[PDB]
Design a protein around this ligand. Structure first.
Ligand SMILES: *C/C=C(C)/C=C/C=C(C)/C=C/C1=C(C)CCCC1(C)C
Length: 137
C-alpha cells in the first residue's frame, strides 16, 4: 500500500535501553538518543519492493529489499546481517536478522502504517523493544 512518503519522527521510546543491551557505553548512548530525535525516513514502495533511506544530521543509509527475499544490511549497533522481511498483515511487516559473523542478542524490526496515518517502527534486541513514531512531512 502507501508506505511511500517522507516521514519525520515525533516520538522515540526505549532507544537507550536497546543500545544498552547491544553494549553501547553511556556517553555514546546519550549522544545516539539525541541523534535519533532528528531521524528522517524516506520510503518508495512498489508492490512488495521497498527502497528506504534513513538519515540523521550527519549520516544517511539506504535499504533496498523485496518482501520474502533475503538481503544484507546492518544491525542497530552496526554489525552486518542477513535479513528477511515478511508481511504480518496489510500494513505491517516484520524483519528477522541473523549475524553474518559471531554472536549477539537476537535482533529484529517492524514497520507499520496505522489507520491514523502514522508510521510506527519497532526495533528489538532480545527482551527490549524500542518504538519510534513518524508522521508525514
Ligand atoms: C525499516 C527501518 C529501519 C531498518 C530503520 C533502521 C534505523 C536504524 C538502524 C537507526 C539507527 C540509529 C542509530 C544506530 C543511532 C543514531 C540514531 C538512529 C536511530 C538513526
Amino acid at each position: 500500500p502507501n508506505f511511500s512518503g517522507n516521514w519525520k519522527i515525533i516520538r522515540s521510546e526505549n532507544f537507550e535501553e536497546l543500545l544498552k543491551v547491544l553494549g553501547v557505553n553511556v556517553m555514546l548512548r546519550k549522544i545516539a538518543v539525541a541523534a535519533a530525535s532528528k531521524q528522517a525516513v524516506e520510503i518508495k514502495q512498489e508492490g512488495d519492493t521497498f527502497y528506504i533511506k534513513v538519515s540523521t544530521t550527519v549520516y544517511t543509509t539506504e535499504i533496498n529489499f523485496k518482501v520474502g527475499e533475503e538481503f544484507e544490511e546492518q544491525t542497530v549497533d552496526g554489525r552486518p546481517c542477513k535479513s528477511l522481511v515478511k508481511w504480518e498483515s496489510e500494513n505491517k511487516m516484520v524483519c528477522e536478522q541473523k549475524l553474518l559473523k559471531g554472536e549477539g542478542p537476537k535482533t529484529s524490526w517492524t514497520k507499520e502504517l496505522t489507520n491514523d496515518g502514522e508510521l510506527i517502527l519497532t526495533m528489538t534486541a532480545d527482551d527490549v523493544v524500542c518504538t519510534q513514531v513518524f508522521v508525514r512531512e
